[PDB]
């Protein structure tokens, strides 16, 4: 609704798109296709890369730093589609850019995209 209006996260649902982490996730949700909000699903690879942002917690007040991790090595899960740009900067600004594949690090090189996690890595 009002794909253009001020980004309002919650806290109570992680499988829909205005969950707090998300902010900036960009692909799809794991928790949807047997990961979970911070692990992969059976059989992809957890990537070492990622992009951050850093997220407002509607429940507490706080902002903590999301690192977006991809869990890759599989065709795109295609449930619980998002993308959210939160403070998301041009690709000359990587770190910072959510149209990058962040999939480097798997394992056995995987580098096709099937979600991503939100983990938290730090407050702000």
């Given at each position: 609704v009002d794909p253009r209006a001020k980004w309002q996260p919650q806290d109570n649902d992680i499988q829909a798109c205005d969950y707090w982490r998300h902010c900036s996730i960009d692909g799809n949700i794991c928790d949807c296709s047997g990961g979970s909000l911070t692990n992969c699903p059976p059989g992809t690879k957890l990537a070492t890369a990622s992009w951050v942002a850093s997220c407002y917690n509607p429940t507490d007040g706080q902002s903590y730093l999301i690192a977006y991790?991809?869990?890759?090595?599989?065709?795109?899960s295609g449930r619980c589609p998002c993308l959210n740009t939160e403070g998301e900067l041009?690709?000359?600004?990587?770190?910072?850019?959510?149209?990058?594949?962040?999939?480097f690090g798997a394992e056995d090189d995987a580098m096709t995209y099937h979600c991503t996690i939100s983990p938290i890595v730090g407050k702000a």
């Amino acid at each position: 609704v009002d794909p253009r209006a001020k980004w309002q996260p919650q806290d109570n649902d992680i499988q829909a798109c205005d969950y707090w982490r998300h902010c900036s996730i960009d692909g799809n949700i794991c928790d949807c296709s047997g990961g979970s909000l911070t692990n992969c699903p059976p059989g992809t690879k957890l990537a070492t890369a990622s992009w951050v942002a850093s997220c407002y917690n509607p429940t507490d007040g706080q902002s903590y730093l999301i690192a977006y991790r991809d869990c890759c090595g599989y065709n795109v899960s295609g449930r619980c589609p998002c993308l959210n740009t939160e403070g998301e900067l041009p690709v000359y600004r990587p770190e910072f850019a959510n149209d990058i594949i962040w999939c480097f690090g798997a394992e056995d090189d995987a580098m096709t995209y099937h979600c991503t996690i939100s983990p938290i890595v730090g407050k702000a």
